[PDB]
Design an enzyme around this catalytic site. Structure first.
Site, short mmCIF file in Angstrom:
data_model
loop_
_atom_site.label_atom_id
_atom_site.label_comp_id
_atom_site.label_asym_id
_atom_site.label_seq_id
_atom_site.Cartn_x
_atom_site.Cartn_y
_atom_site.Cartn_z
N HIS A 142 8.80 -1.50 10.18
CA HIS A 142 7.64 -1.08 9.66
C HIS A 142 6.34 -2.07 10.33
CE1 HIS A 142 5.12 0.81 6.57
NE2 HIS A 142 4.34 -0.31 6.73
N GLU A 143 6.73 -3.29 10.06
CA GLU A 143 5.71 -4.27 10.33
C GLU A 143 5.31 -4.32 11.86
OE1 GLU A 143 3.78 -5.00 7.70
OE2 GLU A 143 5.57 -4.57 6.23
N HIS A 146 3.33 -1.67 13.29
CA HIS A 146 1.67 -1.75 12.90
C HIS A 146 1.38 -2.20 14.14
CE1 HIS A 146 1.14 -0.24 8.86
NE2 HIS A 146 1.75 -0.96 8.36
N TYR A 157 -7.35 1.78 9.56
CA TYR A 157 -6.58 1.52 8.31
C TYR A 157 -7.07 2.05 7.00
CZ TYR A 157 -2.23 -0.39 5.95
OH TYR A 157 -1.30 -0.61 5.32
N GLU A 166 0.26 4.29 8.38
CA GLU A 166 1.30 4.24 7.36
C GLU A 166 2.67 4.80 7.74
OE1 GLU A 166 2.37 2.17 5.07
OE2 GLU A 166 1.03 0.98 6.15
N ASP A 226 -6.46 1.42 -2.46
CA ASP A 226 -5.33 1.24 -1.32
C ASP A 226 -5.94 1.98 0.05
OD1 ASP A 226 -2.79 1.18 -0.05
OD2 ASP A 226 -2.35 3.08 -0.61
N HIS A 231 -0.75 4.06 1.62
CA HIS A 231 0.32 4.09 1.45
C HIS A 231 1.05 5.35 0.45
CE1 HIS A 231 -0.41 -0.23 2.31
NE2 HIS A 231 0.68 -0.11 2.96
#
Ligand SMILES: CC(C)CCNC(=O)[C@H](CC(C)C)NP(=O)(O)CNC(=O)OCc1ccccc1
Ligand SMILES: [Ca+2]
Ligand SMILES: [Ca+2]
Ligand SMILES: [Ca+2]
Ligand SMILES: [Ca+2]
Ligand SMILES: [Zn+2]
Length: 316
Positions: A142-143, A146, A157, A166, A226, A231
């Site tokens: 996931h990271e 990005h 974002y 996301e 958020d 998310h």
């Protein structure tokens, strides 16, 4: 650092033994020279100054508790690199074998992980909400995803583009988890989330609503928390991706599944050829339809299934 490539051994966050690629020069460093221009893992030493120090070890054995998050950040970055190279012919996050850098032991009791514009960063968690977050292969992927997004579509974002950003990270996090093929699922973060509670996860792609995330556009969050719900609203796209791969009937709309590999091809092409920094959900649908058309043909099942899935989650 300049040195010779070596192979260490250690245990990860979940207590599993694995080999890691290291570099020897006086110390053994978490520097894997076998992939691109290297994968480098750093110790942030419970502080917030980044990257911290390149991880150094006297004996090339990484079995200490303190070592575990580093072992997994390093190893799972390697798996993620392999996924992008072998499956999508992409060399690191920039497509040109950029060095991949991660720091672990970031801050104290830190219940998150992130890409800071230049590197991956992993908290240890507080032991209640999370254990060290690099223990999840889906989290690591996931990271790193990005970074891929930032170098390609560049999805801003916030709001819908941010929810797509996301979802792209959750989708590829999951596809990497399946690629490694150890307890794969369509849940996010289950390996490191809430050690005192079995069977849960941070998000679900198969049923986002189980954790209160929307599974239909009519249930989207429109507030400011958020970053406009990045998310949260990711659930709408996660559900569409799950349906494309696995099929199902959702709010009465039936989707014929086409499998993970085709899902990955369609979304990778959308991400790299069609999406832009400001793409919204409707534009993602169009990008996915065009991508499937390019790959499989306008009259294909794959195109029909992409349309069905977006219909099912209320995105036109
Ligand atoms: C809801 C909350 C508890 C976690 C949100 N984080 C996440 O979902 C994931 C981590 C999970 C896959 C385990 N971390 P992330 O990368 O989305 C944050 C934000 C930011 C940070 C640096 C530079 C620009 C913007
Ligand atoms: Ca050691
Ligand atoms: Ca799993
Ligand atoms: Ca998972
Ligand atoms: Ca749990
Ligand atoms: Zn994310």
């Amino acid at each position: 650092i300049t040195g010779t490539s070596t192979v260490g051994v250690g245990r990860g966050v979940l207590g599993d033994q694995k080999n890691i690629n290291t570099t020897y020069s006086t110390y053994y460093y978490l520097q894997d020279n076998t992939r691109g221009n290297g994968i480098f893992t750093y110790d942030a030493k419970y502080r917030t100054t980044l990257p911290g120090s390149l991880w150094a070890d006297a004996d090339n054995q990484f079995f200490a508790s303190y070592d575990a998050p580093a072992v997994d950040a390093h190893y799972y970055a390697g798996v993620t690199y392999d996924y992008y190279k072998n499956v999508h012919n992409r060399l690191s996050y920039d497509g040109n074998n950029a060095a991949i850098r991660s720091s672990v032991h970031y801050s104290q009791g830190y219940n998150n992980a992130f890409w800071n514009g230049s590197q991956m960063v992993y908290g240890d968690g507080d032991g209640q909400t999370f254990i060290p977050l690099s223990g999840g292969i889906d989290v690591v992927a996931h990271e790193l995803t990005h970074a891929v997004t930032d170098y390609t579509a560049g999805l801003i974002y916030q709001n819908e583009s941010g929810a797509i950003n996301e979802a792209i990270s959750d989708i590829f996090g999951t596809l990497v988890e399946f690629y490694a093929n150890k307890n794969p699922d369509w849940e996010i973060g289950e390996d490191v989330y809430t050690p005192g509670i079995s069977g849960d996860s941070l998000r679900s792609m198969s049923d986002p609503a189980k954790y209160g995330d929307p599974d239909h556009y009519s249930k989207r969050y429109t507030g400011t928390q958020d970053n406009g719900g990045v998310h949260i609203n990711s659930g709408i796209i996660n559900k569409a991706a799950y349906l494309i791969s696995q099929g199902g009937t959702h709010y009465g709309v039936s989707v014929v599944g086409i499998g993970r590999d085709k899902l990955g091809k369609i979304f990778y092409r959308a991400l790299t050829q069609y999406l832009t920094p400001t793409s919204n959900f409707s534009q993602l649908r169009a990008a996915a339809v065009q991508s499937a058309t390019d790959l499989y043909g306008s009259t294909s099942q794959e195109v029909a299934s992409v349309k069905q899935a977006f219909d099912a989650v209320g995105v036109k």
